[PDB]
Amino acid sequence: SHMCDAFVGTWKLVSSENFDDYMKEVGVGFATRKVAGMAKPNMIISVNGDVITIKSESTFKNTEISFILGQEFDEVTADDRKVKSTITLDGGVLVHVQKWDGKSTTIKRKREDDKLVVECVMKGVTSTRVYERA
Ligand SMILES: C=CCn1c(S)nnc1COc1ccc(Cl)cc1
């Protein structure tokens, strides 16, 4: 009974494009790029009241964020950046902006057919990561 409804569930990574180039743009080092690029995460999304939780479980590094839309929070990313994040809903798309060290990256998550498509942008470099229901 909320529009974030169509994101809720357990999702498994099924394709990725350009993720190595995105990670380079972000500043991820060689060994982390290689190990992280292998990972096939499951993404678990839930909602409880105003609080959204997004968990990522993988061979590389389990993560979990909980947040309220529009309200900034601290996040330690899988690659160990300490970032300040704000997530909003813009026309049905969850828009996640991460700021650190004067840099910014945006991760958009949207439902498209039976997929959840994740677009990660750092400057001119975009990676597209497609998830299907587990
Ligand atoms: C950015 C995309 C969000 N995401 C997806 S989709 N799968 N894993 C992640 C978490 O972000 C990472 C950032 C840098 C590295 Cl090295 C590894 C993961």
From Swiss-Prot:
GO biological process, alphabetically ordered: brown fat cell differentiation; cellular response to lithium ion; cellular response to tumor necrosis factor; cholesterol homeostasis; fatty acid transport; long-chain fatty acid transport; negative regulation of DNA-templated transcription; positive regulation of cold-induced thermogenesis
UniProt motif Nuclear localization signal: location: 24-34
Xref: Pfam families: Lipocalin
Positions of modified residues (N-acetylcysteine): C4
Keyword annotations from UniProtKB, A to Z: Acetylation, Cytoplasm, Lipid-binding, Nucleus, Phosphoprotein, Transport
Residues with Phosphoserine modification: S15
PTM-bearing positions, type Phosphotyrosine: Y22
Location of the protein in the cell: Cytoplasm; Nucleus
Predominant localisation class: cytoplasm
Cellular compartments per GO CC: cytoplasm; cytosol; extracellular exosome; lipid droplet; nucleus
Any GO MF annotation of the entry: fatty acid binding
Top-rank taxon: Eukaryota
UniProt: a fatty acid binding residues: R129, V130, Y131
Family assignment from sequence similarity: Belongs to the calycin superfamily. Fatty-acid binding protein (FABP) family.
Function: Lipid transport protein in adipocytes. Binds both long chain fatty acids and retinoic acid. Delivers long-chain fatty acids and retinoic acid to their cognate receptors in the nucleus.
Domain notes: Forms a beta-barrel structure that accommodates hydrophobic ligands in its interior.
Subunit relationships: Monomer. Homodimer. Interacts with PPARG.
Name recorded for this polypeptide: Fatty acid-binding protein, adipocyte
Phylogenetic classification of the source organism: Eukaryota, Metazoa, Chordata, Craniata, Vertebrata
Gene this protein is translated from: FABP4
